[PDB]
From a paper:
In order to facilitate the purification costs, we searched the ESTHER database for a thermophilic esterase, and identified the Esterase 2 from Thermogutta terrifontis (TtEst2) that has been previously structurally characterized, and presents an open active site that could ease protein engineering for further optimizations. The recombinant protein was purified, biochemically characterized, and its kinetic behavior towards different OPNA studied, before performing a structural analysis of its complexes formed when soaked in a racemic solution of the OPNA. Biophysical characterizations demonstrated that TtEst2 is a monomer in solution, with some polydispersity and good thermostability at physiological pH. We determined the bimolecular inhibition rate constants for five representative OPNA, namely tabun, sarin, cyclosarin, VX, and paraoxon, to estimate if this enzyme could scavenge them at a fast pace.
Continuing this characterization, we solved the structures of the tabun, cyclosarin, and paraoxon conjugates. For each of these structures, the mobile region 165–190 could not be reasonably modeled, despite the presence of multiple disconnected blobs in the Fo–Fc map, notably a peak of >4 σ at the location of the indole ring of Trp180 in the VX-TtEst2 structure. For paraoxon, the strong electron density peak at covalent distance of Ser126 was modeled as an ethylphosphoryl adduct. This is consistent with the loss of the ethyl group close to the His248 through the dealkylation “aging” mechanism of cholinesterases. As in all the previous structures, the additional peak of electron density in the vicinity of the three different adducts was modeled as small molecules, a phosphate with partial occupancy (0.7 and 0.75) for tabun-TtEst2 and cyclosarin-TtEst2, and a carbonate for paraoxon-TtEst2, depending on the respective shape (trigonal or tetrahedral) in the feature-enhanced maps. However, the active site of TtEst2 being largely open to the solvent, there are no residues that could stabilize the leaving groups of paraoxon and VX, which are in consequence freely moving in the solvent.
Author numbering: 5 to 167, 185 to 281
Write the structure that this text describes.
Amino acid sequence: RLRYPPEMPGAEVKVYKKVDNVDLKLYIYKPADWKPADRRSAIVFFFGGGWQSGSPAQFRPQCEYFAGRGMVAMAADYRVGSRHNVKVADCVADAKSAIRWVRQHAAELGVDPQKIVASGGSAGGHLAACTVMVPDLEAPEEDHTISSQANAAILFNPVLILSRERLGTEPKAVSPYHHIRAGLPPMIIFHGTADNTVPFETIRLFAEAMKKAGNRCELVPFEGAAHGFFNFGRGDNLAYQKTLELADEFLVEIGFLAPK
């Protein structure tokens, strides 16, 4: 089960942000035959936990998988309410910092700065959505001429409508649904139809409005599945395996990954 601080065997650790004397880390899984001159796609995972808890260990299985497939895969730590005096808008700033850091350091990471994927589950899927479509909420001292916007997203039962005391902004400013517009990066979404934490209908409504604006927004329902269905260990790792094979296919389709 998940522990914080996480153990991340085999990952290279880099501090991507220093803020209130906290050193926030990225845990980086490089593929075989990796070289700095490479231009691989990257994927950055944001754990779930209601913006209050959670662990980067959550997406360690997925990191190992996508590293095995030739991406530079990484799990980001970010500040959360039970550990740091933060609100949702601060978590957004951290998620954006992580994407900007990867892009800023793309040359030394062997990464194509235009093939950075944001990903996460629940609150972390909300953060990944924020890095593709929610404006502003940037760390004020960072270089805003380096974009923090990811080039694609892969979302595991995200929160996408926040339409209050722990947000740190007026709710629309952290609500991906309220920033749907044309010209957005492609994404795929996995959600359980029996999710009692985040109602499936909010996600269905989100995807229909994205498609109307011309965006590639694929929603894959998991019939009768509950919140968290996708994680390593839940069930018999069937949905775990299925989301990875569908996410893999999605990355191949958009040109970020080579076919197996």
